[PDB]
Amino acid sequence: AAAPVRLGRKRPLPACPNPLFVRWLTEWRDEATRSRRRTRFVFQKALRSLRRYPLPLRSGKEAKILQHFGDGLCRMLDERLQRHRTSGGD
């Protein structure tokens, strides 16, 4: 039906398993790879660091405190949450 994610109980486990964050980061990850730009490397590392951090990410501010998120990333990801929030939130 959908693409089977090859997963498991392998470590390091994702400290942020939040379906909102997990999805939109993976969407923009494959899109950053699709763009073939520098945005690929900086975003993929930012994705790792976001889901590496066991913090209560409920807003874009908890993404801003990561220095692995560049100023450009902190903008676009804060907007990703905000636009979807105004669209319904779920």
PDB file of all heavy atoms in Angstrom, residues 47-83:
ATOM      1  N   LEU A  47      18.150  16.763  10.677  1.00  0.00           N
ATOM      2  CA  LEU A  47      17.114  15.730  10.893  1.00  0.00           C
ATOM      3  C   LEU A  47      17.597  14.749  11.968  1.00  0.00           C
ATOM      4  O   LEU A  47      16.847  14.406  12.898  1.00  0.00           O
ATOM      5  CB  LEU A  47      16.811  15.010   9.535  1.00  0.00           C
ATOM      6  CG  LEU A  47      15.672  13.907   9.493  1.00  0.00           C
ATOM      7  CD1 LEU A  47      15.175  13.706   8.042  1.00  0.00           C
ATOM      8  CD2 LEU A  47      16.117  12.537  10.089  1.00  0.00           C
ATOM      9  N   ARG A  48      18.866  14.303  11.812  1.00  0.00           N
ATOM     10  CA  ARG A  48      19.515  13.369  12.749  1.00  0.00           C
ATOM     11  C   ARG A  48      19.557  13.988  14.152  1.00  0.00           C
ATOM     12  O   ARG A  48      19.157  13.354  15.111  1.00  0.00           O
ATOM     13  CB  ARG A  48      20.963  13.005  12.293  1.00  0.00           C
ATOM     14  CG  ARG A  48      21.080  12.366  10.891  1.00  0.00           C
ATOM     15  CD  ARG A  48      20.227  11.097  10.718  1.00  0.00           C
ATOM     16  NE  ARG A  48      20.667   9.996  11.597  1.00  0.00           N
ATOM     17  CZ  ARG A  48      20.810   8.713  11.229  1.00  0.00           C
ATOM     18  NH1 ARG A  48      20.633   8.335   9.969  1.00  0.00           N
ATOM     19  NH2 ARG A  48      21.160   7.809  12.127  1.00  0.00           N
ATOM     20  N   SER A  49      19.982  15.267  14.214  1.00  0.00           N
ATOM     21  CA  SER A  49      20.178  16.020  15.471  1.00  0.00           C
ATOM     22  C   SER A  49      18.844  16.302  16.187  1.00  0.00           C
ATOM     23  O   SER A  49      18.780  16.276  17.421  1.00  0.00           O
ATOM     24  CB  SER A  49      20.925  17.341  15.166  1.00  0.00           C
ATOM     25  OG  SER A  49      22.142  17.081  14.476  1.00  0.00           O
ATOM     26  N   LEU A  50      17.781  16.541  15.398  1.00  0.00           N
ATOM     27  CA  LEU A  50      16.434  16.829  15.929  1.00  0.00           C
ATOM     28  C   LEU A  50      15.857  15.576  16.612  1.00  0.00           C
ATOM     29  O   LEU A  50      15.364  15.634  17.739  1.00  0.00           O
ATOM     30  CB  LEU A  50      15.483  17.300  14.793  1.00  0.00           C
ATOM     31  CG  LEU A  50      14.078  17.802  15.254  1.00  0.00           C
ATOM     32  CD1 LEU A  50      14.201  19.071  16.147  1.00  0.00           C
ATOM     33  CD2 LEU A  50      13.132  18.038  14.045  1.00  0.00           C
ATOM     34  N   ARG A  51      15.971  14.433  15.910  1.00  0.00           N
ATOM     35  CA  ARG A  51      15.460  13.137  16.389  1.00  0.00           C
ATOM     36  C   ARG A  51      16.468  12.438  17.332  1.00  0.00           C
ATOM     37  O   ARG A  51      16.146  11.410  17.927  1.00  0.00           O
ATOM     38  CB  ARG A  51      15.097  12.222  15.189  1.00  0.00           C
ATOM     39  CG  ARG A  51      14.053  12.824  14.209  1.00  0.00           C
ATOM     40  CD  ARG A  51      13.538  11.790  13.186  1.00  0.00           C
ATOM     41  NE  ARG A  51      12.790  10.706  13.852  1.00  0.00           N
ATOM     42  CZ  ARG A  51      12.479   9.519  13.315  1.00  0.00           C
ATOM     43  NH1 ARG A  51      12.882   9.180  12.098  1.00  0.00           N
ATOM     44  NH2 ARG A  51      11.745   8.667  14.016  1.00  0.00           N
ATOM     45  N   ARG A  52      17.687  12.998  17.440  1.00  0.00           N
ATOM     46  CA  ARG A  52      18.714  12.555  18.411  1.00  0.00           C
ATOM     47  C   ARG A  52      18.419  13.171  19.785  1.00  0.00           C
ATOM     48  O   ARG A  52      18.702  12.568  20.826  1.00  0.00           O
ATOM     49  CB  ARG A  52      20.126  13.019  17.927  1.00  0.00           C
ATOM     50  CG  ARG A  52      21.326  12.671  18.837  1.00  0.00           C
ATOM     51  CD  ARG A  52      21.592  11.164  18.918  1.00  0.00           C
ATOM     52  NE  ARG A  52      22.775  10.856  19.741  1.00  0.00           N
ATOM     53  CZ  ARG A  52      23.021   9.680  20.330  1.00  0.00           C
ATOM     54  NH1 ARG A  52      22.161   8.672  20.233  1.00  0.00           N
ATOM     55  NH2 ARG A  52      24.138   9.520  21.017  1.00  0.00           N
ATOM     56  N   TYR A  53      17.809  14.368  19.768  1.00  0.00           N
ATOM     57  CA  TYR A  53      17.536  15.156  20.980  1.00  0.00           C
ATOM     58  C   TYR A  53      16.215  14.705  21.644  1.00  0.00           C
ATOM     59  O   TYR A  53      15.155  14.811  21.025  1.00  0.00           O
ATOM     60  CB  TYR A  53      17.532  16.686  20.642  1.00  0.00           C
ATOM     61  CG  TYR A  53      18.833  17.390  21.057  1.00  0.00           C
ATOM     62  CD1 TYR A  53      19.997  17.306  20.284  1.00  0.00           C
ATOM     63  CD2 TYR A  53      18.896  18.112  22.251  1.00  0.00           C
ATOM     64  CE1 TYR A  53      21.166  17.925  20.689  1.00  0.00           C
ATOM     65  CE2 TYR A  53      20.059  18.725  22.658  1.00  0.00           C
ATOM     66  CZ  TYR A  53      21.189  18.632  21.878  1.00  0.00           C
ATOM     67  OH  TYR A  53      22.351  19.249  22.289  1.00  0.00           O
ATOM     68  N   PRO A  54      16.270  14.168  22.909  1.00  0.00           N
ATOM     69  CA  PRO A  54      15.063  13.817  23.689  1.00  0.00           C
ATOM     70  C   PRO A  54      14.458  15.053  24.400  1.00  0.00           C
ATOM     71  O   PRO A  54      14.371  15.108  25.634  1.00  0.00           O
ATOM     72  CB  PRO A  54      15.607  12.750  24.680  1.00  0.00           C
ATOM     73  CG  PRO A  54      17.026  13.171  24.943  1.00  0.00           C
ATOM     74  CD  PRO A  54      17.517  13.835  23.666  1.00  0.00           C
ATOM     75  N   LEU A  55      14.050  16.056  23.602  1.00  0.00           N
ATOM     76  CA  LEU A  55      13.385  17.274  24.102  1.00  0.00           C
ATOM     77  C   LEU A  55      11.901  17.272  23.673  1.00  0.00           C
ATOM     78  O   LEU A  55      11.558  16.642  22.657  1.00  0.00           O
ATOM     79  CB  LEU A  55      14.162  18.568  23.645  1.00  0.00           C
ATOM     80  CG  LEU A  55      14.582  18.699  22.131  1.00  0.00           C
ATOM     81  CD1 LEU A  55      13.397  18.946  21.167  1.00  0.00           C
ATOM     82  CD2 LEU A  55      15.657  19.796  21.951  1.00  0.00           C
ATOM     83  N   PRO A  56      10.992  17.944  24.447  1.00  0.00           N
ATOM     84  CA  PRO A  56       9.572  18.089  24.061  1.00  0.00           C
ATOM     85  C   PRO A  56       9.374  19.116  22.912  1.00  0.00           C
ATOM     86  O   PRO A  56       9.027  20.283  23.149  1.00  0.00           O
ATOM     87  CB  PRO A  56       8.890  18.531  25.389  1.00  0.00           C
ATOM     88  CG  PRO A  56       9.967  19.279  26.125  1.00  0.00           C
ATOM     89  CD  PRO A  56      11.269  18.585  25.771  1.00  0.00           C
ATOM     90  N   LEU A  57       9.653  18.678  21.665  1.00  0.00           N
ATOM     91  CA  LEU A  57       9.401  19.487  20.458  1.00  0.00           C
ATOM     92  C   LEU A  57       7.881  19.577  20.181  1.00  0.00           C
ATOM     93  O   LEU A  57       7.236  18.610  19.790  1.00  0.00           O
ATOM     94  CB  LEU A  57      10.229  18.993  19.209  1.00  0.00           C
ATOM     95  CG  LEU A  57      10.579  17.463  19.087  1.00  0.00           C
ATOM     96  CD1 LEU A  57       9.346  16.545  19.035  1.00  0.00           C
ATOM     97  CD2 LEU A  57      11.506  17.222  17.874  1.00  0.00           C
ATOM     98  N   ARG A  58       7.321  20.750  20.472  1.00  0.00           N
ATOM     99  CA  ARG A  58       5.890  21.063  20.290  1.00  0.00           C
ATOM    100  C   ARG A  58       5.725  22.300  19.386  1.00  0.00           C
ATOM    101  O   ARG A  58       4.628  22.585  18.889  1.00  0.00           O
ATOM    102  CB  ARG A  58       5.252  21.285  21.690  1.00  0.00           C
ATOM    103  CG  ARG A  58       5.374  20.049  22.615  1.00  0.00           C
ATOM    104  CD  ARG A  58       4.900  20.295  24.053  1.00  0.00           C
ATOM    105  NE  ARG A  58       5.079  19.086  24.887  1.00  0.00           N
ATOM    106  CZ  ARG A  58       4.785  18.987  26.187  1.00  0.00           C
ATOM    107  NH1 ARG A  58       4.246  20.006  26.852  1.00  0.00           N
ATOM    108  NH2 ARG A  58       5.027  17.855  26.823  1.00  0.00           N
ATOM    109  N   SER A  59       6.845  23.010  19.166  1.00  0.00           N
ATOM    110  CA  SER A  59       6.900  24.252  18.392  1.00  0.00           C
ATOM    111  C   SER A  59       8.273  24.362  17.688  1.00  0.00           C
ATOM    112  O   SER A  59       9.223  23.622  18.017  1.00  0.00           O
ATOM    113  CB  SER A  59       6.646  25.463  19.332  1.00  0.00           C
ATOM    114  OG  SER A  59       6.588  26.687  18.616  1.00  0.00           O
ATOM    115  N   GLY A  60       8.359  25.308  16.733  1.00  0.00           N
ATOM    116  CA  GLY A  60       9.566  25.552  15.937  1.00  0.00           C
ATOM    117  C   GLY A  60      10.743  26.109  16.745  1.00  0.00           C
ATOM    118  O   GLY A  60      11.880  26.098  16.269  1.00  0.00           O
ATOM    119  N   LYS A  61      10.456  26.610  17.965  1.00  0.00           N
ATOM    120  CA  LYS A  61      11.471  27.181  18.886  1.00  0.00           C
ATOM    121  C   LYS A  61      12.443  26.082  19.370  1.00  0.00           C
ATOM    122  O   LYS A  61      13.656  26.317  19.485  1.00  0.00           O
ATOM    123  CB  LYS A  61      10.804  27.892  20.110  1.00  0.00           C
ATOM    124  CG  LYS A  61      10.058  29.221  19.792  1.00  0.00           C
ATOM    125  CD  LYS A  61       8.771  29.038  18.945  1.00  0.00           C
ATOM    126  CE  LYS A  61       8.062  30.364  18.623  1.00  0.00           C
ATOM    127  NZ  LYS A  61       7.669  31.083  19.859  1.00  0.00           N
ATOM    128  N   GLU A  62      11.888  24.877  19.625  1.00  0.00           N
ATOM    129  CA  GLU A  62      12.675  23.695  20.046  1.00  0.00           C
ATOM    130  C   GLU A  62      13.551  23.173  18.893  1.00  0.00           C
ATOM    131  O   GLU A  62      14.503  22.436  19.135  1.00  0.00           O
ATOM    132  CB  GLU A  62      11.769  22.546  20.590  1.00  0.00           C
ATOM    133  CG  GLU A  62      11.000  22.874  21.895  1.00  0.00           C
ATOM    134  CD  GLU A  62       9.770  23.780  21.689  1.00  0.00           C
ATOM    135  OE1 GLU A  62       8.681  23.257  21.416  1.00  0.00           O
ATOM    136  OE2 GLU A  62       9.885  25.020  21.804  1.00  0.00           O
ATOM    137  N   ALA A  63      13.208  23.550  17.647  1.00  0.00           N
ATOM    138  CA  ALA A  63      14.027  23.257  16.453  1.00  0.00           C
ATOM    139  C   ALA A  63      15.103  24.345  16.248  1.00  0.00           C
ATOM    140  O   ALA A  63      16.187  24.063  15.726  1.00  0.00           O
ATOM    141  CB  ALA A  63      13.131  23.130  15.207  1.00  0.00           C
ATOM    142  N   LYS A  64      14.785  25.591  16.673  1.00  0.00           N
ATOM    143  CA  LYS A  64      15.688  26.755  16.544  1.00  0.00           C
ATOM    144  C   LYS A  64      16.936  26.617  17.432  1.00  0.00           C
ATOM    145  O   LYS A  64      18.025  27.053  17.031  1.00  0.00           O
ATOM    146  CB  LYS A  64      14.940  28.069  16.900  1.00  0.00           C
ATOM    147  CG  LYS A  64      13.965  28.567  15.814  1.00  0.00           C
ATOM    148  CD  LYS A  64      13.176  29.819  16.267  1.00  0.00           C
ATOM    149  CE  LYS A  64      12.417  30.481  15.115  1.00  0.00           C
ATOM    150  NZ  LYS A  64      11.486  29.545  14.442  1.00  0.00           N
ATOM    151  N   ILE A  65      16.773  26.026  18.637  1.00  0.00           N
ATOM    152  CA  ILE A  65      17.889  25.880  19.601  1.00  0.00           C
ATOM    153  C   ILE A  65      19.009  24.958  19.058  1.00  0.00           C
ATOM    154  O   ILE A  65      20.147  25.028  19.535  1.00  0.00           O
ATOM    155  CB  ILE A  65      17.379  25.429  21.042  1.00  0.00           C
ATOM    156  CG1 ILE A  65      16.721  23.987  21.052  1.00  0.00           C
ATOM    157  CG2 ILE A  65      16.400  26.496  21.621  1.00  0.00           C
ATOM    158  CD1 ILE A  65      17.679  22.810  21.246  1.00  0.00           C
ATOM    159  N   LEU A  66      18.679  24.093  18.060  1.00  0.00           N
ATOM    160  CA  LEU A  66      19.691  23.276  17.355  1.00  0.00           C
ATOM    161  C   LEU A  66      20.506  24.171  16.401  1.00  0.00           C
ATOM    162  O   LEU A  66      19.938  24.808  15.509  1.00  0.00           O
ATOM    163  CB  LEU A  66      19.064  22.094  16.540  1.00  0.00           C
ATOM    164  CG  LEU A  66      18.445  20.894  17.334  1.00  0.00           C
ATOM    165  CD1 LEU A  66      19.401  20.378  18.425  1.00  0.00           C
ATOM    166  CD2 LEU A  66      17.055  21.236  17.892  1.00  0.00           C
ATOM    167  N   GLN A  67      21.832  24.205  16.608  1.00  0.00           N
ATOM    168  CA  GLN A  67      22.775  24.935  15.740  1.00  0.00           C
ATOM    169  C   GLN A  67      22.980  24.191  14.393  1.00  0.00           C
ATOM    170  O   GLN A  67      23.488  24.780  13.435  1.00  0.00           O
ATOM    171  CB  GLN A  67      24.129  25.124  16.482  1.00  0.00           C
ATOM    172  CG  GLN A  67      24.036  26.012  17.745  1.00  0.00           C
ATOM    173  CD  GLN A  67      25.360  26.120  18.505  1.00  0.00           C
ATOM    174  OE1 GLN A  67      26.185  26.988  18.223  1.00  0.00           O
ATOM    175  NE2 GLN A  67      25.569  25.248  19.479  1.00  0.00           N
ATOM    176  N   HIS A  68      22.585  22.894  14.344  1.00  0.00           N
ATOM    177  CA  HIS A  68      22.606  22.075  13.103  1.00  0.00           C
ATOM    178  C   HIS A  68      21.485  22.498  12.141  1.00  0.00           C
ATOM    179  O   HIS A  68      21.574  22.241  10.935  1.00  0.00           O
ATOM    180  CB  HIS A  68      22.508  20.564  13.432  1.00  0.00           C
ATOM    181  CG  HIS A  68      23.762  20.020  14.065  1.00  0.00           C
ATOM    182  ND1 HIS A  68      23.790  19.597  15.369  1.00  0.00           N
ATOM    183  CD2 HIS A  68      25.003  19.882  13.533  1.00  0.00           C
ATOM    184  CE1 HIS A  68      25.030  19.219  15.602  1.00  0.00           C
ATOM    185  NE2 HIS A  68      25.803  19.373  14.519  1.00  0.00           N
ATOM    186  N   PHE A  69      20.418  23.115  12.686  1.00  0.00           N
ATOM    187  CA  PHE A  69      19.433  23.850  11.879  1.00  0.00           C
ATOM    188  C   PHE A  69      19.992  25.253  11.587  1.00  0.00           C
ATOM    189  O   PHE A  69      20.082  26.081  12.491  1.00  0.00           O
ATOM    190  CB  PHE A  69      18.045  23.951  12.590  1.00  0.00           C
ATOM    191  CG  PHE A  69      17.192  22.685  12.473  1.00  0.00           C
ATOM    192  CD1 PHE A  69      17.208  21.713  13.462  1.00  0.00           C
ATOM    193  CD2 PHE A  69      16.381  22.468  11.352  1.00  0.00           C
ATOM    194  CE1 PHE A  69      16.437  20.573  13.353  1.00  0.00           C
ATOM    195  CE2 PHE A  69      15.612  21.324  11.241  1.00  0.00           C
ATOM    196  CZ  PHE A  69      15.644  20.374  12.239  1.00  0.00           C
ATOM    197  N   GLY A  70      20.401  25.493  10.320  1.00  0.00           N
ATOM    198  CA  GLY A  70      20.800  26.833   9.866  1.00  0.00           C
ATOM    199  C   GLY A  70      19.639  27.818   9.920  1.00  0.00           C
ATOM    200  O   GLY A  70      18.496  27.392  10.074  1.00  0.00           O
ATOM    201  N   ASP A  71      19.917  29.126   9.787  1.00  0.00           N
ATOM    202  CA  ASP A  71      18.870  30.179   9.862  1.00  0.00           C
ATOM    203  C   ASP A  71      17.739  29.921   8.842  1.00  0.00           C
ATOM    204  O   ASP A  71      16.559  30.025   9.180  1.00  0.00           O
ATOM    205  CB  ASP A  71      19.502  31.574   9.643  1.00  0.00           C
ATOM    206  CG  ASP A  71      18.474  32.726   9.566  1.00  0.00           C
ATOM    207  OD1 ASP A  71      17.595  32.830  10.454  1.00  0.00           O
ATOM    208  OD2 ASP A  71      18.548  33.548   8.635  1.00  0.00           O
ATOM    209  N   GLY A  72      18.139  29.514   7.620  1.00  0.00           N
ATOM    210  CA  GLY A  72      17.205  29.155   6.554  1.00  0.00           C
ATOM    211  C   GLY A  72      16.302  27.984   6.931  1.00  0.00           C
ATOM    212  O   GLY A  72      15.090  28.035   6.708  1.00  0.00           O
ATOM    213  N   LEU A  73      16.906  26.944   7.552  1.00  0.00           N
ATOM    214  CA  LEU A  73      16.176  25.747   8.016  1.00  0.00           C
ATOM    215  C   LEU A  73      15.158  26.120   9.123  1.00  0.00           C
ATOM    216  O   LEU A  73      13.990  25.758   9.037  1.00  0.00           O
ATOM    217  CB  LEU A  73      17.145  24.641   8.528  1.00  0.00           C
ATOM    218  CG  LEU A  73      18.204  24.095   7.513  1.00  0.00           C
ATOM    219  CD1 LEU A  73      19.025  22.944   8.144  1.00  0.00           C
ATOM    220  CD2 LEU A  73      17.547  23.655   6.184  1.00  0.00           C
ATOM    221  N   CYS A  74      15.613  26.904  10.122  1.00  0.00           N
ATOM    222  CA  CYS A  74      14.785  27.346  11.272  1.00  0.00           C
ATOM    223  C   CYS A  74      13.519  28.110  10.812  1.00  0.00           C
ATOM    224  O   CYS A  74      12.446  27.965  11.415  1.00  0.00           O
ATOM    225  CB  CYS A  74      15.633  28.224  12.219  1.00  0.00           C
ATOM    226  SG  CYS A  74      17.017  27.355  12.982  1.00  0.00           S
ATOM    227  N   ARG A  75      13.669  28.892   9.722  1.00  0.00           N
ATOM    228  CA  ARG A  75      12.552  29.615   9.077  1.00  0.00           C
ATOM    229  C   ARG A  75      11.520  28.626   8.497  1.00  0.00           C
ATOM    230  O   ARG A  75      10.363  28.601   8.918  1.00  0.00           O
ATOM    231  CB  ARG A  75      13.075  30.545   7.942  1.00  0.00           C
ATOM    232  CG  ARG A  75      14.019  31.680   8.399  1.00  0.00           C
ATOM    233  CD  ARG A  75      14.553  32.511   7.215  1.00  0.00           C
ATOM    234  NE  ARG A  75      15.561  33.504   7.632  1.00  0.00           N
ATOM    235  CZ  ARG A  75      15.798  34.675   7.017  1.00  0.00           C
ATOM    236  NH1 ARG A  75      15.052  35.087   5.995  1.00  0.00           N
ATOM    237  NH2 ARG A  75      16.784  35.438   7.437  1.00  0.00           N
ATOM    238  N   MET A  76      11.998  27.770   7.575  1.00  0.00           N
ATOM    239  CA  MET A  76      11.145  26.895   6.745  1.00  0.00           C
ATOM    240  C   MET A  76      10.403  25.831   7.579  1.00  0.00           C
ATOM    241  O   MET A  76       9.251  25.501   7.285  1.00  0.00           O
ATOM    242  CB  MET A  76      12.007  26.205   5.661  1.00  0.00           C
ATOM    243  CG  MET A  76      12.733  27.171   4.705  1.00  0.00           C
ATOM    244  SD  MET A  76      13.724  26.336   3.449  1.00  0.00           S
ATOM    245  CE  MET A  76      14.728  25.233   4.446  1.00  0.00           C
ATOM    246  N   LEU A  77      11.081  25.306   8.613  1.00  0.00           N
ATOM    247  CA  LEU A  77      10.523  24.267   9.501  1.00  0.00           C
ATOM    248  C   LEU A  77       9.515  24.876  10.489  1.00  0.00           C
ATOM    249  O   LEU A  77       8.518  24.234  10.823  1.00  0.00           O
ATOM    250  CB  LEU A  77      11.648  23.477  10.247  1.00  0.00           C
ATOM    251  CG  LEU A  77      12.370  22.355   9.427  1.00  0.00           C
ATOM    252  CD1 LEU A  77      11.383  21.251   8.992  1.00  0.00           C
ATOM    253  CD2 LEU A  77      13.130  22.930   8.218  1.00  0.00           C
ATOM    254  N   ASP A  78       9.761  26.127  10.938  1.00  0.00           N
ATOM    255  CA  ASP A  78       8.800  26.854  11.803  1.00  0.00           C
ATOM    256  C   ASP A  78       7.496  27.114  11.018  1.00  0.00           C
ATOM    257  O   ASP A  78       6.394  26.977  11.557  1.00  0.00           O
ATOM    258  CB  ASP A  78       9.404  28.189  12.300  1.00  0.00           C
ATOM    259  CG  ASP A  78       8.565  28.870  13.401  1.00  0.00           C
ATOM    260  OD1 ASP A  78       8.801  28.593  14.603  1.00  0.00           O
ATOM    261  OD2 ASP A  78       7.689  29.698  13.077  1.00  0.00           O
ATOM    262  N   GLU A  79       7.662  27.461   9.720  1.00  0.00           N
ATOM    263  CA  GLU A  79       6.545  27.675   8.782  1.00  0.00           C
ATOM    264  C   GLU A  79       5.815  26.360   8.482  1.00  0.00           C
ATOM    265  O   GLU A  79       4.607  26.360   8.351  1.00  0.00           O
ATOM    266  CB  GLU A  79       7.040  28.304   7.458  1.00  0.00           C
ATOM    267  CG  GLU A  79       7.639  29.701   7.623  1.00  0.00           C
ATOM    268  CD  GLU A  79       8.102  30.315   6.299  1.00  0.00           C
ATOM    269  OE1 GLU A  79       9.251  30.066   5.884  1.00  0.00           O
ATOM    270  OE2 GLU A  79       7.309  31.049   5.664  1.00  0.00           O
ATOM    271  N   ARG A  80       6.560  25.250   8.387  1.00  0.00           N
ATOM    272  CA  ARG A  80       5.995  23.906   8.113  1.00  0.00           C
ATOM    273  C   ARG A  80       4.940  23.536   9.188  1.00  0.00           C
ATOM    274  O   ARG A  80       3.800  23.148   8.867  1.00  0.00           O
ATOM    275  CB  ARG A  80       7.150  22.862   8.051  1.00  0.00           C
ATOM    276  CG  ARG A  80       6.716  21.395   7.866  1.00  0.00           C
ATOM    277  CD  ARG A  80       5.864  21.154   6.602  1.00  0.00           C
ATOM    278  NE  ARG A  80       6.571  21.484   5.351  1.00  0.00           N
ATOM    279  CZ  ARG A  80       6.090  21.267   4.118  1.00  0.00           C
ATOM    280  NH1 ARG A  80       4.895  20.723   3.940  1.00  0.00           N
ATOM    281  NH2 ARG A  80       6.802  21.610   3.064  1.00  0.00           N
ATOM    282  N   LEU A  81       5.334  23.734  10.460  1.00  0.00           N
ATOM    283  CA  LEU A  81       4.452  23.520  11.627  1.00  0.00           C
ATOM    284  C   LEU A  81       3.285  24.532  11.631  1.00  0.00           C
ATOM    285  O   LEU A  81       2.131  24.135  11.789  1.00  0.00           O
ATOM    286  CB  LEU A  81       5.248  23.617  12.965  1.00  0.00           C
ATOM    287  CG  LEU A  81       6.036  22.343  13.421  1.00  0.00           C
ATOM    288  CD1 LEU A  81       7.108  21.896  12.397  1.00  0.00           C
ATOM    289  CD2 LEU A  81       6.651  22.577  14.822  1.00  0.00           C
ATOM    290  N   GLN A  82       3.607  25.833  11.424  1.00  0.00           N
ATOM    291  CA  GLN A  82       2.630  26.946  11.527  1.00  0.00           C
ATOM    292  C   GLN A  82       1.497  26.821  10.482  1.00  0.00           C
ATOM    293  O   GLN A  82       0.320  26.953  10.820  1.00  0.00           O
ATOM    294  CB  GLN A  82       3.340  28.320  11.360  1.00  0.00           C
ATOM    295  CG  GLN A  82       2.381  29.537  11.431  1.00  0.00           C
ATOM    296  CD  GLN A  82       3.043  30.878  11.135  1.00  0.00           C
ATOM    297  OE1 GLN A  82       4.210  31.091  11.437  1.00  0.00           O
ATOM    298  NE2 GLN A  82       2.303  31.790  10.518  1.00  0.00           N
ATOM    299  N   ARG A  83       1.877  26.570   9.218  1.00  0.00           N
ATOM    300  CA  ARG A  83       0.936  26.449   8.083  1.00  0.00           C
ATOM    301  C   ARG A  83       0.005  25.254   8.296  1.00  0.00           C
ATOM    302  O   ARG A  83      -1.204  25.368   8.097  1.00  0.00           O
ATOM    303  CB  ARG A  83       1.686  26.301   6.728  1.00  0.00           C
ATOM    304  CG  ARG A  83       2.572  27.509   6.333  1.00  0.00           C
ATOM    305  CD  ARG A  83       3.368  27.250   5.039  1.00  0.00           C
ATOM    306  NE  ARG A  83       4.399  28.275   4.784  1.00  0.00           N
ATOM    307  CZ  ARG A  83       5.459  28.106   3.975  1.00  0.00           C
ATOM    308  NH1 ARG A  83       5.677  26.944   3.374  1.00  0.00           N
ATOM    309  NH2 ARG A  83       6.309  29.097   3.791  1.00  0.00           N
TER     310      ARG A  83
END
